[PDB]
């Protein structure tokens, strides 16, 4: 029993050392250094296209690499592939389990993945010889609901789950090749690095982490939020990532500084973020909300600029294209909207 | 008016035609979330190593899909939000333990007050009535040291099931029922309700009991849209 007390004391003192080292490494706040810089100015955004057809609420969505097609998974048991230029539907894949919580689009455009409460991940082969889609692989093996997929490339996908782990798979092999452990609550979302070399993962313990797909091992562990982290994404340079949590709102972290730079709050905002994605230049942080809105926070300023009101139920997913031309927001009212 | 785009628009209409006859199946079934205690979960009388379990049963040519969550970790404040559109939540309580009954009361209270479940009515199955009958009649374990209020509770105006019910067993039986009903009526806004039932371990007349309460739930939902109620 005394050894447990000794280990607890060691952990407490090492945490004190960590927090003191992070202290005094910060000279000026991002607000102070970004004081002369001019505001973005109130931005007005309007729905250019409203995609209809999903029956129940939408839990996830993902833009394609061409910034033209996107997949969206809804809990009616279907995920369908749109053409956001013409609102036409390219595919409509029926799922085996209706409780899908995430989806992803393969960079090559050949594959689409999905997963949900049921602890599994399914890879769908789009470009097929027969012309009819079919499940190419089921990546079974971990407990707990699966809450985010993100194809590294063809034949390699990374998954986050509610068993407080993350895994790296081998699609053709079908076996976990690496597993990332250390989170204590459910892992809600992860974002691959722009160079597809690391990734971040916020969890239901109000703490984020950074990994490396080469050898499974946590590099940094950023704290600061007060409740469940709901979404996370990389800043375009790959040297930052903004995570929006249920605590109040959103935050920005820098890997190399290893400390929160600055937050994004306001008194009226009283619910929690549901999904986050940066803009192309990392100058417009976008964020979903339980109040059915999607605020548009300028990254460098602590004051929001625009609002994307238009959804009837809560907003669950949003993502900016690779060319930055458009922004899509699915929501629990079962509609997608393409703002520009 | 393009030429190559004709094939795409033709394709988007085959999909719409297929989605159209899936809309009328998705709306013709009722989705029930089967929650409750770890034990007393009986999705067998109602008749690949993980995830979620689904059993489909049909009553009066109405289709029900009931999802028994399994193989999930302990914390459930986050995947519970997936079931905000189910027609009803079935909550099964193991009475006749007196020990984890309070831990089942608190569990039902959290369900009632959740922000994403405020409109979903729960069907309450006070399960294991047979064990309750034996427990009070034996008298070895007495329900006073877990709920002091049982020293003053008097049986209400109700319907004892059969002539032969001991007044004691029909008193404790209804006392537990009222504990859940205090929690249910606290959120006074009548946007959802709780339907109590005294189930047993095995009861044939148990699939229909779910049917009638969903029938009541739907009717009560339609009458609200017409401001008739």
């Amino acid at each position, epitope marked *: 029993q005394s050894e447990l007390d000794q280990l*607890r004391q060691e952990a407490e003192q090492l*945490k004190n050392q960590i927090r003191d080292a992070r202290k005094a490494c910060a000279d000026a706040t991002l607000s102070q250094i970004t004081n002369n810089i001019d505001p973005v100015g109130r931005i007005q955004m309007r729905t250019r296209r409203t995609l209809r057809g999903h029956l129940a609420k939408i839990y996830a969505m993902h833009w394609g690499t061409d910034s033209r097609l996107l997949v969206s998974a809804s809990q009616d048991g279907k995920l369908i592939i749109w053409d956001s230029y013409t609102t036409n539907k390219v595919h409509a894949i029926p799922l085996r389990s209706s409780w899908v919580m995430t989806c992803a689009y393969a960079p090559s455009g050949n594959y689409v993945a999905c997963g949900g409460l049921d602890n599994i991940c399914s890879i769908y082969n789009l470009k097929t010889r027969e012309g009819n889609v079919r499940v190419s692989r089921e990546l079974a093996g971990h407990t707990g609901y699966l809450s985010c997929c993100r194809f590294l490339d063809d034949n390699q996908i990374v998954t986050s789950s509610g068993d*407080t782990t993350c895994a790296l798979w081998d699609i053709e092999t079908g076996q976990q090749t690496t597993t990332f452990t250390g989170h*204590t*609550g459910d892992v809600m979302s992860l974002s691959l690095a722009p160079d597809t070399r690391l990734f971040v993962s916020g969890a*239901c*313990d*109000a*703490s984020a982490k950074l990994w490396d797909v080469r050898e499974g091992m946590c590099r940094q562990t950023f*704290t*600061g939020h*007060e*409740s*469940d982290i709901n979404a996370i994404c990389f800043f375009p340079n790959g040297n930052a990532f903004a995570t929006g949590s*249920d*605590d*109040a709102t959103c935050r920005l972290f820098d890997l190399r500084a290893d400390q929160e730079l600055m937050t994004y709050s306001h008194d009226n905002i*009283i619910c*929690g973020i549901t999904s986050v994605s940066f803009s192309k230049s990392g100058r417009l942080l976008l964020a979903g909300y339980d109040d059915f809105n999607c605020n548009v926070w300028d990254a460098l300023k602590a004051d929001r600029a625009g609002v994307l009101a238009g959804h009837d139920n809560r907003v669950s997913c949003l993502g900016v294209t690779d060319d930055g031309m458009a922004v899509a927001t699915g929501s629990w009212d079962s509609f997608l909207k393409i703002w520009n | 008016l393009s030429a190559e785009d004709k094939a795409a628009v033709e394709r988007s209409k085959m999909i719409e035609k297929q989605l159209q006859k899936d809309k009328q199946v998705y709306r013709a079934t009722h989705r029930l979330l089967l929650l409750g205690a770890d034990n007393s979960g009986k999705s067998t009388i109602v008749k690949k190593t993980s995830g979620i379990f689904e059993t489909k049963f049909q009553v009066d040519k109405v289709n029900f899909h009931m999802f028994d969550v399994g193989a999930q*970790r*302990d*914390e*459930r*404040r986050k995947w519970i939000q997936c079931f905000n559109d189910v027609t009803a939540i079935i909550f099964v309580v193991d009475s006749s333990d007196y020990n984890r009954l*309070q*831990e089942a009361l*608190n569990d039902f*209270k*959290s369900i009632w*007050n*959740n*922000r994403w479940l405020r409109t979903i009515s729960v069907i309450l199955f006070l399960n294991k009535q047979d064990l309750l009958a034996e427990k009070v009649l034996a008298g070895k374990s007495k329900i006073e*040291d*877990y*709920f*002091p*209020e049982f020293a003053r509770y008097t049986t209400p105006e109700d319907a004892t099931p059969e002539p032969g019910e001991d007044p004691r067993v029909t008193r404790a039986k209804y006392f537990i029922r009222d504990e859940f009903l205090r929690i249910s009526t606290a959120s006074g806004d009548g946007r959802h309700y709780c339907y109590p039932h005294f189930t047993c371990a095995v009861d044939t007349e148990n699939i229909r009991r779910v049917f009638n309460d969903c029938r009541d739930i739907i009717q009560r939902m339609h009458l609200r849209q017409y401001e008739l109620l």
Partner: nanobody
Amino acid sequence: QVQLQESGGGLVQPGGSLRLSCAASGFTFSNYKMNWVRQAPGKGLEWVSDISQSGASISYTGSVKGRFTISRDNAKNTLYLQMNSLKPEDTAVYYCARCPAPFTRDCFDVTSTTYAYRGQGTQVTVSS
């Protein structure tokens, strides 16, 4: 990072008294519900008492009803559980708890594996 430090446990004769003070830091205070959960040896951990944001919706487990008193000091960032008449059945680790969300009236916090916003624990032992 959030913290929940509790203190007050010790050896007490039956019918004695104790005070359990919960020191919190690293997260908004008033905005949340707070709970008391104890873990008696040889079985699982159970919920005891709760108090809302303002501090006006007290509620107890029947076992300790009419015996224990809770109080929230928002200014002090503290929570208390006054203990009046001990029994040898309350001998247990105590765990100051927090709700996972703010401005909300529900809490799934009894969990037996890894709930994060929960105190580290103090042992109260009642014997002779």
